[PDB]
Amino acid sequence: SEVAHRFKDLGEENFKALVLIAFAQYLQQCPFEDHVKLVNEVTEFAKTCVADESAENCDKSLHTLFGDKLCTVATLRETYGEMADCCAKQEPERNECFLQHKDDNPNLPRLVRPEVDVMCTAFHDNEETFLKKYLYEIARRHPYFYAPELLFFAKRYKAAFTECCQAADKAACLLPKLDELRDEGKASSAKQRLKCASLQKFGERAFKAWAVARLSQRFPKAEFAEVSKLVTDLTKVHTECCHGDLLECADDRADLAKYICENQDSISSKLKECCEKPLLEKSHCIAEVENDEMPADLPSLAADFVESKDVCKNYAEAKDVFLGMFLYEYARRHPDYSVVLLLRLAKTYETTLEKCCAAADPHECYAKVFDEFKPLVEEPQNLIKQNCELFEQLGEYKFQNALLVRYTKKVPQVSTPTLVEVSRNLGKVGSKCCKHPEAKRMPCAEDYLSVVLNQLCVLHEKTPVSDRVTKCCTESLVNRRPCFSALEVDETYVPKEFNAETFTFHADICTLSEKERQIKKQTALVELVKHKPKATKEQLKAVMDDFAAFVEKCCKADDKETCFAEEGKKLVAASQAA
Length: 578
Ligand SMILES: CCCC1C(=O)N2C(N(C)C)=Nc3ccc(C)cc3N2C1=O
Ligand SMILES: CCCC1C(=O)N2C(N(C)C)=Nc3ccc(C)cc3N2C1=O
Known about the structure:
Serum_albumin-like, mainly alpha, Serum Albumin, Chain A, Domain 1, binds azapropazone, identical protein binding, 6 domains, disease variant
């Protein structure tokens, strides 16, 4: 039995949660209730298997079990149409079908939160249900949310209410901590989406490379044989969490933290504090631990990678181990380099050894490789230096508008909402990284841009409308950013035509939070640039300044909401003029 296997390892609490998240992440539309039912029916079954390890079907694979349980409600196409397909299939045909149907943008209603008085009541009255509802709302909206980590956010979430509800002003104590959590989880969720896209779209070799370079930066003192050990396991973990095998992912993830803490001295000296706490907190700590100090006397890379005469021979013997080593070596001494640049260099090196080693005199040929790294290294530095300057001058909001105009011009076919979210996140790189010293700027900026551009790539993959987004997203994982930065304006885009339904206005806007207004303002700017690409940042600007005036005004006018009827036709006259 496997269900029994995992149960004993995780226990009732975690086992019950993971299965909830797994169910929530598969049938994102189904109601909380039904998920709970199935979870319990599933948990009960497990309990018997523990005793009699051959009872009913305790001999199967989680999937068959999990799959059939969901198929007791999925067959309801009237609710989940395209799902019935999946159930008519059989493992593994069935499982893939489910994974392939997860929605990165569910049509789930916004999740507003009741007043502090209700939450604390509901929390206090019934706890487990309160926290179950939390996991369900997160897992269903983030189908790739790294499960093990979601449990950590949960324990954290619980402590928020557990303390704040006993305050002198709950609202004051809760709100903050709740906000800080909503953000941090959106970040977690995106870093994870990239890892799964990598594994799924590009293959484990690509993820392995990513990991080697990332881990080598974090643990410079660790050894190549050691890192590789870690890279092998870590890859398996994610591979499981990204294929929907949550229980094993969680299990293996625990075993990995166990190992890493045991062999502490062999890996990093900054792990101590991590290994002295509860599992869930232990794991989250290791994954976020700062890099260890760099080993003192380190030889020059040129030694064994460009000057040695045995280069090509070693490359031929174990090209993967050789390139593996080159990356580990270059990464361990460059924590000031974003992981994607390290991978670009590694690819530039591989390409060179390929053409060079089949030459009349390899050495002569590959002797100047580092001369090419110079451009690759400076491109990002200059880009960051430039973009943080602009940011510092315009502030976040204005900087995001800039990126909005700029991207809409690159890929005008992309849907306005997607362009708005992505440009807003791209501009958050300013506040997130520009306040760093150049030594830490690049890894912060350029790797964060990979996570943001991946969203666009996955949101776009649902309904592809721009081959330029497809080219840049599918050509090379590591070069995505460089690809997009090269795009200028689409010369073949045929401008749109002003609609009435292209953009509705109904006064309902004067009630929305401040943020939700800039957003409505930004959504406008996008639609503008699509209707007038060839327009300039001069006109556009002056115009944006106008719209601000319209809202600030009419939202303070006492006529029936017809000040838009009259002034709405008024602005239209001005707009067409520009
Ligand atoms: C639009 C954002 C609404 C929103 C929100 O408030 N959330 C929240 N709460 C309830 C604190 N915690 C989260 C933690 C991690 C993630 C990924 C998402 C949320 N979650 C949301 O999606
Ligand atoms: C960027 C950090 C590199 C990195 C790292 O050290 N990780 C790790 N261990 C314990 C090796 N376990 C994980 C668990 C959860 C998350 C979200 C990420 C990791 N994983 C990484 O992605």
